[PDB]
Design a protein around this ligand. Structure first.
Ligand SMILES: Cc1cc2nc3c(=O)[nH]c(=O)nc-3n(C[C@H](O)[C@H](O)[C@H](O)COP(=O)(O)OP(=O)(O)OC[C@H]3O[C@@H](n4cnc5c(N)ncnc54)[C@H](O)[C@@H]3O)c2cc1C
Ligand SMILES: N#Cc1ccc(CNc2nc3cc(C(F)(F)F)ccc3nc2C(=O)O)cc1
Ligand SMILES: C[C@H](CO)OC[C@@H](C)OC[C@@H](C)O
Length: 456
């Protein structure tokens, strides 16, 4: 319906740029705009935008066009027999999860928030708590319809012709065109619940040992919080949450009558029940230690999505802190075999004088064939630093460390890394760029990130 000049940032609310934002529920209108941008030969180009949950500058285009895809949110079909869903790129994973449950179907890859679009999920090739067993979002896309620079709509599949373009679009950050529509293969489920095992470790060595002892193959889902502030040996201690989807006979009789129902997110969160924090005189001593170890250690606990998958939700408004501004989100992965190198990076972080509380630790499994896919088999870490003197130059050093240890950064979280660091981290970038130049010779699709990371 409308085109509007708008100041656009990522979720991190940093590096703002003004673009013409097109918001239409009409698909033929989206096709026309891309054809109009291409008629000039790609003036300053266009880029799709979803829900803006990426922290960086991948979903903005200063002095150019941004197409909002959220109004394109029709669920065309769900089929329980073939396990397939046909949805527009603008549907979000919360919406899809809600719609698919009554069929006994599960969204195969869920990120730490359900507010992301299908287009957004494919474009960043998002990963979730179950990566080691299921791969990333791209692994589960059976087909997609891509609007290219030439104004045509190409029907892509993971195998067969245009496979190269499919796998370039996966993790392509919108730089091969606009995903309009997609078929996802879902995971069959009989309940909307998990069976969980909790474990708490005392150190980083202990956290690594737990992930290396072969136990990870017993759980489809697995992730941890870790201590990034304490000095060794407390550095790297973890609360690990692992589990699998439950069967209906594994549910208590109470919940057996509605196995696939989703519980309404509660009104009262912890900040509302305890306004003045959780800490008491015991918290930071040996009794405090024992309490966390006991509460974080359990076997066969039945949990809903909110409990098992979104454990930050109970903590309400407290620590993000004031928002995602002003904090710098930083995520990387170090190859599995590089255990000593990974241990070094963690030590570098704690000695930096930059303090992160909100921490994710997860061991990734095998990678996919997308040349710009973020995930590789290894140690995935997410940290959250308050913007503060010396931070920029510190994370540049972290970049060097990650790069040197065979790892990489994640575009969905980045806003500040250099093109050189990035290109070295992604050794298949030239291969990907070649594909991009075949499908968009005029640079009809472009973004701040494309220009910054020299993927243009
Ligand atoms: C609280 C929080 C938790 C998170 N947890 C995780 C996690 O556990 N795992 C993980 O992998 N990520 C995570 N993320 C990052 C998030 O999953 C990605 O940034 C995701 O891509 C956001 O989707 P979106 O619809 O908001 O896309 P946007 O941020 O709006 O766009 C991001 C990129 O996708 C492209 N894009 C969007 N729609 C389309 C389309 N229709 N066609 C072509 N390209 C398109 C854009 O061009 C842009 O390059 C998290 C983010 C937040 C804020
Ligand atoms: N402490 C803590 C904590 C921090 C973040 C979250 C949920 N957010 C995320 N959770 C994430 C979870 C993973 C996982 F590895 F588990 F898949 C990977 C990346 C993630 N990224 C984010 C993000 O905020 O960008 C939950 C608890
Ligand atoms: C988002 C992710 C669950 O998919 O959470 C990871 C960390 C915070 O573990 C959860 C509990 C043990 O804190």
């Amino acid at each position: 319906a409308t085109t509007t000049a708008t100041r656009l940032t990522g979720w991190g609310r940093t590096a703002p740029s003004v673009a013409n934002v097109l918001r239409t529920p009409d698909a033929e209108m989206i096709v026309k705009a891309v054809a109009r941008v291409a008629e000039s030969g790609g003036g300053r180009g266009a880029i799709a935008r979803g829900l803006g949950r990426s922290y960086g500058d991948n979903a903005q285009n200063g002095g150019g066009l941004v197409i909002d895809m959220t109004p394109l949110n029709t669920i065309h079909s769900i089929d329980a027999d073939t396990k397939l869903v046909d949805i527009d790129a603008g549907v979000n994973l919360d919406q899809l999860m809600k719609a698919a449950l009554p069929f006994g179907l599960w969204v195969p890859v869920l990120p730490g928030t359900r507010q992301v679009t299908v287009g957004g999920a494919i474009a960043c090739d998002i990963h979730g708590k179950n990566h080691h067993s299921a791969g990333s979002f791209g692994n589960h896309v059976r087909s997609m319809d891509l609007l290219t620079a030439d104004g045509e709509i190409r029907h892509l599949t993971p195998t067969g012709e245009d496979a190269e373009l499919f796998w370039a679009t996966v993790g392509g950050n919108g730089l091969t065109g606009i995903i309009m529509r997609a078929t996802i293969e879902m995971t069959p489920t009989s309940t909307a619940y998990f069976i969980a095992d909790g474990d708490v470790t005392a150190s980083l060595d202990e956290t690594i040992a737990l992930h290396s002892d072969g136990s990870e193959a017993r759980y489809t889902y697995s992730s941890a919080w870790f201590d990034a502030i304490s000095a060794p040996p407390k550095l790297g201690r973890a609360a690990v949450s692992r589990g699998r989807l439950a069967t209906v006979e594994q549910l208590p009789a109470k919940l057996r009558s509605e196995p696939l129902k989703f519980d309404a997110p509660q009104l009262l969160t912890l900040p509302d029940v305890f306004p003045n924090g959780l800490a008491n005189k015991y918290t930071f001593g040996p009794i405090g230690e024992l309490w966390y170890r006991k509460s974080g250690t359990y076997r066969g606990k039945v949990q809903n999505l909110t409990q098992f998958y979104h454990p930050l939700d109970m903590f309400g408004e407290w620590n993000r802190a004031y928002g995602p501004a002003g904090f710098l989100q930083y995520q990387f992965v170090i190859p599995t075999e590089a255990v000593d190198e990974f241990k070094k990076i963690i030590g570098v972080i704690q000695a930096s004088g930059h303090y992160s509380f909100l921490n994710v630790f997860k061991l990734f499994g095998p990678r996919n064939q997308a040349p710009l896919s973020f995930p590789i088999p290894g140690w995935n870490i997410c940290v959250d630093f308050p913007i503060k003197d010396g931070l920029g130059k510190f994370v540049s050093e972290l970049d060097r460390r990650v790069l040197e240890f065979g790892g990489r950064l994640y575009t969905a979280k980045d806003s500040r890394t250099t093109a050189e660091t990035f290109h070295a981290m992604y050794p298949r970038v030239d291969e990907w760029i070649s594909v991009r130049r075949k499908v968009d010779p005029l640079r009809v699709f472009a973004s701040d990130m494309a220009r910054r990371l020299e993927l243009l």
